[PDB]
């Protein structure tokens, strides 16, 4: 069975990103609908996978990063609207049986994610 | 006074990506209000910045690129949804006598951006 | 010496959205009397290594470069891309601070880009 | 013709990496020769390209970034020898007649290279 998962990593500490608050939406073309909310862990991950099993349908979704308040959390005192507040990742699944890991690599400034294993 | 630019690199050919479709978008509370649309050049870059003088505000914002269609008209066939359509950038602007560059380094399964 | 800690790494291929497989690699120790092989490895079918490169009493401190050899896995993936390729030996130079913990260095890669970090 | 040049982007703070020392090495099969030496300018750029006309030749090259010491004179204290110190970017230029932009994204805990434009 495919699972959804992702993973928050701080490059300004090479650490987790732990704590940080996370939404799941299905995307369809009158509207989202939130599917879940998490918090990562200690290693910058969900303890369950976002979906999984019949849950993990083919469609299109945004993972949303609540990245601007784990920093602020981190003592980062930055001006607002910071550059880097919510970070929205749309993205779609078309193989409902092969695992979609994409993870967030996050900096105040700068962002990267990708499609991984 | 500032201004708001972008950049597209097509890291799949180590070129700029061409012919990218753009839409920026302020966030608000009751929604988005869109400000402009836009195609990259051929150093994909836009002719004219996004936004400029007074009309870079304070607040935050949304530029969408449309890659998906970008790399299907690069002959690259892929099955739907693509991984990588519609790329959403939100971001915010602190100080509007700043230039804020938001480039995006793309590919079908993996993009990065940065403030430049 | 420490036994506790791990280095490892983990080759993404981002114009095929998975892993790098196959993609020969090489450890080296870098330090003021030169670069000394520590170990050769391929990437099995998850792009990791089915061994840890270094780990325990071996893995100490000091300098480190990782030299993937992304040019020739693209090459045998079907790309035909003049010599010498812009991507062809990528070299990840890193320094390792404290023994006892694990450093995973994993390497994102397009034959016209790559990235590294220290991930968990 | 073709010109190469770079780019040091600290994403730490969102500004170019000033005053960063780099050296442009030519990597052949009996040893490496040092090029060029030179510091990046208010604008994370050089002054000057790094390789212009008849200097651009086809072969393999090594650009070496003094990042560890960029990011101790912005006052980051890290454990030595650090993640990230000298950042050694090996690549390769098949044609001298293109340009070649290769900048640097960097936090101490992270990096990313492209052939730019």
């Known amino acids: 069975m495919g699972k959804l998962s992702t ?51 083919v469609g299109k979704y945004e993972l949303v990063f609540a990245a601007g308040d784990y920093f602020a959390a981190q003592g980062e005192q930055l001006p607002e609207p910071r550059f880097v507040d919510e970070v929205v990742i749309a993205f779609g699944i078309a193989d409902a049986s092969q695992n979609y890991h994409v993870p967030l690599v996050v900096s105040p400034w700068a962002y990267s994610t990708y499609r991984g294993s």
Do not use: F, M, W
């Open 7 to 57: 993973h928050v990593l701080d490059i300004t500490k090479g650490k987790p990103g732990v704590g940080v608050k996370l939404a799941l939406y299905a995307v369809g073309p009158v509207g989202k609908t939130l599917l879940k909310q998490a918090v990562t862990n200690s290693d910058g991950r969900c303890d369950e996978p976002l979906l999984a099993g019949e849950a993990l349908q």
